[PDB]
Structures are given as structure tokens and as C-alpha cells.
Enzyme design. Sequence first.
Site, mmCIF file in Angstrom:
data_model
loop_
_atom_site.group_PDB
_atom_site.id
_atom_site.type_symbol
_atom_site.label_atom_id
_atom_site.label_comp_id
_atom_site.label_asym_id
_atom_site.label_seq_id
_atom_site.Cartn_x
_atom_site.Cartn_y
_atom_site.Cartn_z
ATOM 1 N N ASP A 137 67.875 1.404 -24.664
ATOM 2 C CA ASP A 137 68.709 1.370 -25.866
ATOM 3 C C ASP A 137 69.343 2.734 -26.101
ATOM 4 O OD1 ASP A 137 69.910 -0.147 -27.854
ATOM 5 O OD2 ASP A 137 68.290 0.100 -29.316
ATOM 6 N N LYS A 139 72.135 4.934 -26.812
ATOM 7 C CA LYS A 139 73.444 4.825 -27.451
ATOM 8 C C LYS A 139 73.476 5.856 -28.573
ATOM 9 C CE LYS A 139 71.739 1.161 -30.510
ATOM 10 N NZ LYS A 139 71.965 -0.209 -31.066
ATOM 11 N N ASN A 142 70.947 6.282 -31.459
ATOM 12 C CA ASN A 142 69.570 6.621 -31.081
ATOM 13 C C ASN A 142 69.407 8.034 -30.531
ATOM 14 O OD1 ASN A 142 68.475 4.240 -31.940
ATOM 15 N ND2 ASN A 142 68.802 3.214 -29.992
ATOM 16 N N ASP A 159 63.835 5.451 -31.218
ATOM 17 C CA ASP A 159 63.978 3.998 -31.154
ATOM 18 C C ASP A 159 63.596 3.410 -29.811
ATOM 19 O OD1 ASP A 159 64.484 1.368 -31.512
ATOM 20 O OD2 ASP A 159 66.529 1.626 -32.281
ATOM 21 N N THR A 178 73.386 -3.217 -26.974
ATOM 22 C CA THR A 178 74.695 -3.215 -27.609
ATOM 23 C C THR A 178 75.760 -3.313 -26.518
ATOM 24 O OG1 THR A 178 73.856 -1.889 -29.457
ATOM 25 C CG2 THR A 178 76.247 -1.857 -29.073
HETATM 26 N N1 LIG Z 1 62.011 9.800 -36.928
HETATM 27 C C1 LIG Z 1 62.994 9.711 -37.851
HETATM 28 N N2 LIG Z 1 63.274 10.702 -38.720
HETATM 29 C C2 LIG Z 1 64.263 10.614 -39.631
HETATM 30 N N3 LIG Z 1 65.049 9.525 -39.749
HETATM 31 C C3 LIG Z 1 64.864 8.461 -38.932
HETATM 32 C C4 LIG Z 1 63.813 8.497 -37.918
HETATM 33 N N4 LIG Z 1 63.851 7.333 -37.250
HETATM 34 C C5 LIG Z 1 64.852 6.605 -37.789
HETATM 35 N N5 LIG Z 1 65.446 7.281 -38.789
HETATM 36 C C6 LIG Z 1 66.571 6.785 -39.593
HETATM 37 O O1 LIG Z 1 66.548 5.378 -39.547
HETATM 38 C C7 LIG Z 1 67.717 4.881 -38.844
HETATM 39 C C8 LIG Z 1 67.325 3.705 -37.991
HETATM 40 O O2 LIG Z 1 66.341 4.074 -37.040
HETATM 41 P P1 LIG Z 1 66.010 3.148 -35.787
HETATM 42 O O3 LIG Z 1 66.026 1.701 -36.215
HETATM 43 O O4 LIG Z 1 64.775 3.661 -35.108
HETATM 44 O O5 LIG Z 1 67.220 3.396 -34.910
HETATM 45 C C9 LIG Z 1 68.245 6.091 -38.092
HETATM 46 O O6 LIG Z 1 69.621 5.994 -37.783
HETATM 47 C C10 LIG Z 1 67.911 7.245 -39.024
HETATM 48 O O7 LIG Z 1 68.852 7.326 -40.086
#
Ligand SMILES: Nc1ncnc2c1ncn2[C@@H]1O[C@H](COP(=O)(O)O)[C@@H](O)[C@H]1O
Lengths: 299, 299
Positions: A137, A139, A142, A159, A178
Site C-alpha cells: 500500500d 502511496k 502512507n 499503514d 489504490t
Molecule cells: N502514527 C500516526 N501518527 C499520527 N497520525 C497518524 C498516524 N497514523 C495515522 N495517522 C493519521 O491517520 C490517517 C489515516 O491513517 P492510516 O489509515 O493508517 O493511513 C493519516 O493520514 C494520519 O492523518
Amino acid sequence: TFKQQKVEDFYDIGEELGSGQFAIVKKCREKSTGLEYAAKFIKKRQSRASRRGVCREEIEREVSILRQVLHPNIITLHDVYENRTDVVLILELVSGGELFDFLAQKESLSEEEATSFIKQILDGVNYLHTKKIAHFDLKPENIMLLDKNIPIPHIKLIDFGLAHEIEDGVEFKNIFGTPEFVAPEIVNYEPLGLEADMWSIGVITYILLSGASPFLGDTKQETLANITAVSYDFDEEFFSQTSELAKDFIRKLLVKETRKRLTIQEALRHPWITPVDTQQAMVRRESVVNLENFKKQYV
Amino acid sequence: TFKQQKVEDFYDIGEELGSGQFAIVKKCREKSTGLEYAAKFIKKRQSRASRRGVCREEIEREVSILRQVLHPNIITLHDVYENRTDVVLILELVSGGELFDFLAQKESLSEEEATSFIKQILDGVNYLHTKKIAHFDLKPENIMLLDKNIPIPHIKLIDFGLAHEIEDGVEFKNIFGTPEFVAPEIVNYEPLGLEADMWSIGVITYILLSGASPFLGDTKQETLANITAVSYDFDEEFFSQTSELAKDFIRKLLVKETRKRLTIQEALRHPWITPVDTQQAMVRRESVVNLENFKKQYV
Ligand SMILES: Nc1ncnc2c1ncn2[C@@H]1O[C@H](COP(=O)(O)O)[C@@H](O)[C@H]1O
Ligand SMILES: Nc1ncnc2c1ncn2[C@@H]1O[C@H](COP(=O)(O)O)[C@@H](O)[C@H]1O
Ligand SMILES: [Ca+2]
């Protein structure tokens, strides 16, 4: 195994930081140490036929992978809790937002600076691939930054929802990802491995340098056709300032045949990433990136 | 052409009926006539790269297909409005919810009654296929009832977001649909046509009779593997009261080779649907839907 305790007994849960399909991420602070993390609440699937949430077995797989990975350019897992409805990953807090959002507010970007970011991605992917873990994934959204307010921001790949350990002699096939970024073997439902990640890196690099996307069409149907036909170009409108070495890098990644596509080790050793003499280092230093189109596309 | 006018100027917009990807559907009443409709608000895509909205061409395609269809078992299109963010389809209102939800409240259900519902679906699909239109999203949630309060409700097929006119000699491939219900040619990214609809009907029939799902695995990866292997059974736990006529119907639909799969015309003339003698009619009458398992699975 997941801790069967209420996460809020152990953490102060703060503001929402972001979300995705299946998941809500909130800032948090562990009460016993005062250190801050991001708590990723993943809604568990409640039935096989449901299209909501994530199957607990797949959550277990992501956790199993995360528990193995400790590298400066890969998100670091701290803990895992579970309640009736959600599994909660306590993740290293990444506060610098997405790389692309940072580059989009940027004033000036050379190919030397671009390769420094790409090389951070390659370092993280190399570490994963050595452990036979495909990310699956890769992209822009991430690819985050620890702190966007320093001279050379520090990339963290996040992610691992689609990540898989590739086993020799065991075929892995699935439909995911995606469209803009998936390799032809994904579109064609053919055996998958570490190579898909390398194609994605090719796509991410292409966009980073030009603001344009190599296979993106008017519709998903077109995008998929373009990918499987490996139909793309280096339109002079957007690539006039791009070095030949940069283009060569991309050309060697955007290759249908998995055997011929650059591996992560070869990518790390490509002259664009790792110049072998002052002559190449200069060409790279003097090649300026296309922040005009990039900003149009990502602002 | 879409009407460049505020739909609210001409319709009172009422409560939500359902939603989807970049679509929200609401009851409405046209002020000038007092007649009720469903307004499908489709969010338009803003950039060719978003995972948000629907591009102009695909919205137009759905409208273009809807304009062509006038059949008792298919929703009719009344009008189309457009503002800055959405295109709004004014559609025939279907008030009786989903077929399966109605069957799940049933006390008893014979294969004779079951086939009369399935025949309504076949009639609708037959009408589309005659016009060379593939629906491409046949699944329970898109099989609705005009009015669930009459003894034998009338079926309306909805949701033409994936529908496509199949042109001779012109190849159509795309990746879409719900894993549980897509044919092998969708999973394998091979040429598509009217046959995919016929496979879906096979899956829907299998679930209607038994409550079980032919290819559904513990994960999407498994489901897709099962589909492409056409790996399914008639487990006696669920099919011990199902007729050989019904099983034959399903066997002839769940076929990988598209040229060997029953066409819609052949399905309408299959003896389980249209018995050729009194004896077959009795067998159908003496066979029963597994409402116990069906209810279990559809709650
Ligand atoms: N470890 C992290 N620290 C801070 N923000 C995060 C983190 N993981 C995810 N996010 C926030 O959550 C969104 C979705 O995360 P994800 O579904 O893992 O891609 C990201 O685009 C960030 O805005
Ligand atoms: N004509 C209609 N009448 C009543 N409900 C509808 C109609 N069309 C769609 N819906 C509901 O709205 C959901 C989303 O519609 P669609 O985006 O066409 O799939 C459907 O799954 C139905 O629950
Ligand atoms: Ca294929």
C-alpha cells in the site's frame, strides 16, 4: 496477543488526528510515562459477509508484521489493546503530516533533495523486503513525516493494513490497493510478491518529480488498462527539467515483467539514488523539480 | 442534458433512504404534482485523481442507461438536476426495502414462491440484456420491493452505477463489484459481457434457497480464490430440502467458461423456473427454502 483491557484506563485519549476506511486515529498519552502516541482504532468485522470493518485475523496479521519491524523510516508499534468492537494499535506518533503536503508548500526542490526523500523510502522498503515483507500500500498518504519543521524532514512509512509476508513457494493473490498505484500483477490477479512495492515506488517518484501521474486516466477503467498495457510517457510539458538518470530510474521500475523490474537493492544502487562520481552528483544537483504542476495537483 | 436548476426549488427533500460511494438517496416530492420520488445525489469528482466523487462521464453513462429502460421490474428515471457539487437523479421511489429483508420475516417459503421472485429478477435482467445492457452489480441490496405490505411484493432492480452497454467487438474490462457476487472474469480481469450478470444470479439464488454463500471465505482473499476456482458445494446441512431442479439451475449459472454459462433467455426457460410438465411443478411445490439458515445469515 492483544491486551483485553480498556485502553482509556492506560491512556488519555485526545483529539482525532485522521481517519481511513475502517480506522480512526486519535492522539494519546500513556498515563504511566507521559509519552505520546497515536491510537489507531480499527473496527473489527462482525461477519464474513459484511463489508464493514476489518476481519480480526487480518488485524492479527498486520500486528504480527508491525511487531517485527524496527527501523527509522518505518512506523514503530508500541502496544495493542482490544475491546468488544475495536482493536487499538498504539503507534509511534508521527506529527509532520504527509510528505506530499510538505512538498506542496515548498518553494524550491532540486533532484538532490528529491532523491534524499526517495532514498528514505527505499531504506524503509529495503528493510521490509529483507524480512520478506511486502507493504502493498505504498502511496503518498502512507508516507508521513516525523516533523515537517526541520531542514530535512524524516520519512515514516505507515499503514500496514495490506502488508503481507511473502513465503517462498506459497502463491499469494488478492485484489486490493489504490488503482493509480497498483502494479500490473495486482490488476491482472497474478502471483504477488515484493515487486509490486517497487512498481509503486516508480509511480510515486514519477508524481514527485512532475506532478503528473503515469497511468491515471479519466476513469478507473482507463487507469487499469493503462497500467496493464504499461502505457505512459514523459510528457515534455512536465518533464522538461527532469534528468535522464531520474527518468531511467522510473523506466526500470515501471516494468510489467516482475523478474525484470528493479529490486529494492538495485533501486538503492541506481546512479540517480547513489551517484558513482562527481559528474553525476552535479547533474542531479542542477536538475530542478516541477513544483508548479505538483502544487496544482496536490493543493 | 442535466437541468441547471436547484432541485430544492422543485422538490421538497425528505428523509434519507440509503447511501453509497459518493451517493446519498432521499425521498422527495415534486411540488408541482405532489408525486413522490427518490432523489439520488451523486457527488461529482473534482479531480481525475480523487478517491472521492464520480466523474462526469460515468454519471452520464448511468443516466443514459436509465433513460432507456422502461420495465415493471426496473426503476424508472424521472428527471436529472445538477448544481455545483452534485448531479441529482430523480428516480421512481421504491418503498418496500430489500427483498431479502422481506423473505427474512417470512414464516414459510416454498421453491415455487421462491422461483416467482427469482423470475421477476430474470424478467428485469432479460429486458436489460435484450438491450445489450449489463447491470454488473446484481446483489441483494440492489433487489428491492415496491411495497412490502402486499402478499406477493413486486421486485424493482436499482443502482445502475456499474451498468454498461456491451458493444460487439469492443472489449470491456474493469475491476468492480462486491467480491461475494462477482464472476471469475471480473476477478481475473478478463473480457466482460452479459454473462457476469448470470453468474451473480446464480449466487443470489444459492443464498436465497440455503442461506449459505457459495464462494464466501473467511477473508476476501479466500473468496476471490474460491470464485476463480469455482469451488463450491451443496452442503447437505443447508441443501437437504432443495430440489435437484434448483441445484441444476445454479450449477448451470456458476460456470467459469462464459460461453457455457446459461444466458438470461435459457435461465427463463430452465424447468426450475418454467416447468414443462405437471410433475416438475409438484416437485418445486414440495421443496422448501431453508428459512432457518437464511434468517441466521441475514441478521
Ligand atoms: N502514527 C500516526 N501518527 C499520527 N497520525 C497518524 C498516524 N497514523 C495515522 N495517522 C493519521 O491517520 C490517517 C489515516 O491513517 P492510516 O489509515 O493508517 O493511513 C493519516 O493520514 C494520519 O492523518
Ligand atoms: N429508487 C430508490 N428508491 C428507494 N431507495 C433507493 C432507490 N435507489 C437507491 N436507494 C437506496 O439507496 C442506496 C444507494 O443507492 P445507489 O447509490 O443507487 O446504490 C440503495 O442501496 C438503496 O438502499
Ligand atoms: Ca488475469
